[PDB]
Design a protein around this ligand. Structure first.
Ligand SMILES: [Mg+2]
Ligand SMILES: [Zn+2]
Lengths: 238, 201, 349, 116
């Protein structure tokens, strides 16, 4: 006897179409230079993309990566971790991964364009309220501890990014970065238990409201992103 | 006096865990026909049933080929009908298959039965359901198939003891002592039993 | 019989008009939490379906319901909702697949529903599908119905139009199927078809033993099928009318070819069939001679005699339709209580 | 020692040094060891012959009847020597062993006769 085939079809109309998304490492930095640099690096990373897929993701997503290592069992290295940040631009761009195993918190900075790495895989795709999850260091280990054998949570092909709106408990005050300040504007943590009302009142004194209203510091990216899309589509057609 | 709590805690936890995730009836009844060893046990089967397990199938595998698993349909105990020429069957009343089974070839079902045309008025539990000795009789050849129609001396020493006792008592009672045997309903081995009385892993 | 075939009351009676996607998502939730679910959900899904992929979803969810905590309910009205949804959208491959692996899906149509299905098969003029389906009905063991005449017509036509010399499975299927339609004790056609089925079963036994006779086929274990056929012939000669066909020649052929030159189920005292062949053949010749001495036209084609049956067929189809409307009425009666039952949960909530 | 379930059983306890067994019929539980503790000592048995050549054995009929009425199973040798005594029915395996011995002796006599 052959097994039946699973099939599922749920067709709410104004949910299915998600249109566009671009990676934050294509965009250049505010610094000045001649954009031919950018465009040649872009076509280079795209001629690499034709080989390697980089299944898109965000901070707070879980990635499993297999890489070709010279000195290891099977000459390969397989590592799963939570994405902390995607830092840098051009080819040297990288993404951080972290996980607690054997009670020890190990984290890597993977180059997403180095030929040493063989394949990347998105086990779970989600987004956190905070731009960067570096406070997961001082956070409890039970939040970062993830299973290595956990299989990919299959995600819909054309749907909106799921966002887990949650909060996180943390280790006591002796921290390294002073996350309580408003310089970072993070919300995953829970002041109500991580500190006192008087303490947050004393800390929110460094608040600089004027800068977020300032306008010469923010960088417009609309037409740059449009030209980047145009060049990507041209390279794909070619 | 000092009590102890972790023992009762582990007892309750083990009870809940086993009653939750006990091995499925189908999972533990499955058999590989070329090696004749039940999985989850690694035990071999009896030589008397080797061939029957190789050839014949199970009750639920028989009942899966007809609607409602054949309520009231003729199923007979192959062992009973090979051991006795008289007809014996099962008036199956209630049925429940195991959802985890792929072919729905395992479960629990029972009703009224009859041994050599001796029917009782009780819908009780079957015995030995998982065996490969199940034979289904069609709806035709039904009534033709289901058609069906003192004392002993005591031991010598015991009778001598009673003789001496009543002679000392004074009564003659020349009649040899006896007991009733028609009351004694010696039942054959094959008379069924209570499934619930026997346990389960 | 277009009036007997078509019935739009079914499709215009008690439609639910719910979202197939919502019903599918709810069923997926219930079955991933592996809790039991009523047949109302599946019925609403089925009678809401109007598409091919939707009927495929229904097939998958029917498999999943068979493998769900509840399997015995087996509501015939839901079965017929599914059957109509499939046959009106003309998925005969899917219908046949489900019907053959009933153990995989568990569909069990009743008399009138199956007669409608086989009449649609007639209208489309296919034989292999109808043959497999009548073998699966032989498996069903449900024949005391007005569809008995349809089964008889089908088998009487296909055993003649077969043109297949050697096939043990197929021949055993034919032999075991030719008994059930004739069990209504009608006439020469009936009991002579019973005779030919006895002959085929005895042949299958003598050529591949008694094991397959009963193993995956509901049959009786008495090996004397030839003796039973001889008994039938002798009691018929003793007793009405006996319209006969030349399948007695096929019986003679089988007998002569068997007379032509491990577990032992046979009993020691009782003789073996291999050793009974001689007296089987002698008594068979004797009964042949007795029958020809006593009806013996052997020209009336049996499949043509089923056209004479069409009159009482068209008479009994009326009672069949009446029973079908009674079934519809009692379905509509007992089903409405189940909807208030579903509302009772929200009332308590 | 409170044994779970179990049931009383009259059986044999062994005594005496090696190569000199002395059996004692005694009531006890099913789960106790061979020479374990008991409840009431009932009788004795010598599988060896005395100076007269006969073998010794004693039964406590009233107490045994009381224990059986209270409910206690017996072992195969128990019922065997009881049936040999006569207070109990004779043993079917005893009958079969006797018949097999007689068949073997008849076979041996036939073999000797056909040899000579
Ligand atoms: Mg530091
Ligand atoms: Zn001593």
């Amino acid at each position: 006897q052959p097994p039946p085939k699973p099939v599922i079809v749920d067709k709410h109309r104004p949910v299915e179409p998600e249109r566009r998304f671009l990676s934050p490492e294509f965009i250049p930095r505010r610094g000045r230079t001649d954009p031919l640099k950018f465009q040649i690096e872009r076509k280079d990373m795209l001629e690499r993309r034709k080989v390697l897929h980089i299944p898109e993701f965000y901070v707070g997503s879980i990635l499993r990566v297999t890489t070709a290592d010279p000195y290891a069992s099977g000459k390969i290295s397989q590592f799963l971790g939570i994405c902390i940040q995607r830092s840098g631009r051009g080819l040297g761009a990288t993404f951080i991964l972290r996980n607690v195993i054997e009670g020890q918190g190990v984290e890597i900075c993977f180059e997403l364009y180095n030929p040493r790495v063989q394949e990347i895989q998105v086990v779970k795709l989600e987004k956190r309220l905070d731009d960067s999850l570096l406070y997961l260091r001082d956070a409890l280990p039970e939040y970062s501890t993830f299973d290595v054998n956990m299989k990919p949570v299959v995600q819909e092909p054309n749907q909106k990014v799921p966002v887990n709106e949650l909060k996180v408990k943390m280790k006591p005050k002796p921290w390294s970065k002073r996350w309580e300040r408003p310089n970072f504007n993070i919300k995953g943590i829970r002041f109500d238990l991580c500190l006192t009302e008087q303490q947050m009142k004393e800390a929110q004194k460094w608040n600089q409201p004027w800068l977020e209203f300032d306008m010469m510091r923010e960088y417009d990216t609309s037409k740059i992103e449009a030209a980047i899309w145009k060049e990507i589509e041209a390279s794909k057609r070619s | 006096v000092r009590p102890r709590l972790i023992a009762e805690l582990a007892r309750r936890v083990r009870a809940l865990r086993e009653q939750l995730n006990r091995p499925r009836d189908s999972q533990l009844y499955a058999v590989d026909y070329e090696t004749l060893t039940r999985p989850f046990s690694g035990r071999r089967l009896p030589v008397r049933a080797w061939a029957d397990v190789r050839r014949e199938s199970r009750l639920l595998q028989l009942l899966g080929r007809l609607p409602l698993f054949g309520l009231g349909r003729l199923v007979t105990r192959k062992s009973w009908l090979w051991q006795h020429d008289e007809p014996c069957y099962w008036r199956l009343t209630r049925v429940r298959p195991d959802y985890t089974a792929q072919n729905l070839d395992h479960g629990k079902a029972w009703g009224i039965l009859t041994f050599k045309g001796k029917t009782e008025s009780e819908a009780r539990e079957i015995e030995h359901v998982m065996y490969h000795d199940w034979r289904l009789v069609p709806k035709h050849e039904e009534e033709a198939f289901t058609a069906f129609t003192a004392s002993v001396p005591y031991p010598p020493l015991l009778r001598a003891m009673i003789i001496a006792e009543r002679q000392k008592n004074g009564d003659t009672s020349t009649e040899e002592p006896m007991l009733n045997v028609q009351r004694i309903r010696m039942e054959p081995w094959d008379y069924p039993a209570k499934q619930e009385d026997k346990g389960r892993a | 019989s277009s009036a007997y075939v078509d019935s739009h009351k079914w499709e215009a009676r008690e439609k639910e008009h719910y979202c197939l996607a919502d019903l599918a998502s709810l069923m997926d939730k219930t079955f991933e939490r592996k809790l039991p679910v009523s047949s109302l959900t599946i019925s609403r899904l089925i009678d809401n379906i109007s598409s091919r992929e939707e009927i495929d979803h229904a097939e998958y969810y029917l498999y999943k319901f068979r493998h769900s905590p509840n399997c015995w309910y087996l509501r015939n009205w839901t079965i017929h909702t599914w059957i109509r949804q499939c046959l009106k959208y003309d998925a005969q491959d899917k219908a046949l697949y489900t019907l053959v692996n009933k153990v995989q899906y568990g569909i069990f149509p009743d008399n009138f529903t199956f007669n409608l299905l086989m009449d649609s098969f007639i209208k489309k003029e296919n034989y292999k599908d109808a043959l497999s389906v009548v073998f699966e009905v032989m498996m069903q063991e449900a024949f005391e119905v007005p569809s008995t005449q349809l089964l008889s017509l089908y088998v009487l036509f296909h055993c003649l139009a077969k043109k297949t010399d050697f096939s043990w499975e197929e021949e055993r299927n034919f032999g075991a199927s030719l008994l059930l339609p004739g069990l209504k004790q009608k006439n020469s056609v009936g009991f002579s078809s019973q005779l030919y089925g006895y002959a085929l079963l005895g042949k299958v036994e003598l050529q591949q033993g008694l094991r397959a006779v009963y193993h995956n086929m509901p049959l009786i274990w008495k090996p004397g099928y030839l003796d039973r056929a001889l008994q039938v012939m002798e009691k018929v000669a003793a007793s009405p009318e006996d319209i006969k066909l030349c399948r007695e020649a096929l019986d003679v052929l089988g007998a002569v070819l068997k007379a032509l030159t491990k577990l032992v189920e046979q009993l020691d005292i009782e003789e073996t069939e291999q050793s009974k062949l001689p007296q089987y053949l002698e008594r068979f010749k004797a009964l042949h001679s007795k029958l020809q001495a006593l009806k013996i036209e052997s020209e009336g084609l049996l499949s043509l005699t089923t056209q004479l049956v069409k009159e009482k067929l068209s008479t009994c189809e009326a009672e069949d339709i009446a029973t079908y409307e009674q079934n519809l009425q009692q379905w509509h009666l007992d089903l409405v209580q189940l909807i208030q039952r579903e509302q009772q949960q929200r009332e308590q909530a | 020692k409170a044994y779970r379930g179990g049931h009383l059983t009259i059986r044999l306890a062994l005594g005496g040094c090696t190569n000199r067994p002395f059996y004692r019929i005694v009531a006890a539980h099913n789960k106790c060891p061979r020479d374990g503790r008991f409840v009431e000592q009932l009788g004795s048995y010598d599988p060896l012959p005395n100076s007269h050549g006969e073998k010794l054995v004693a039964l406590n009929l009233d107490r045994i009847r009381h224990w059986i009425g209270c409910g206690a199973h017996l072992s195969k040798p128990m019922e065997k020597l009881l049936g040999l005594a006569g207070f109990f029915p004779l043993h079917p395996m005893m009958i079969t062993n006797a018949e097999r011995l007689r068949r073997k002796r008849a076979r041996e006599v036939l073999l000797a006769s056909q040899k000579t």
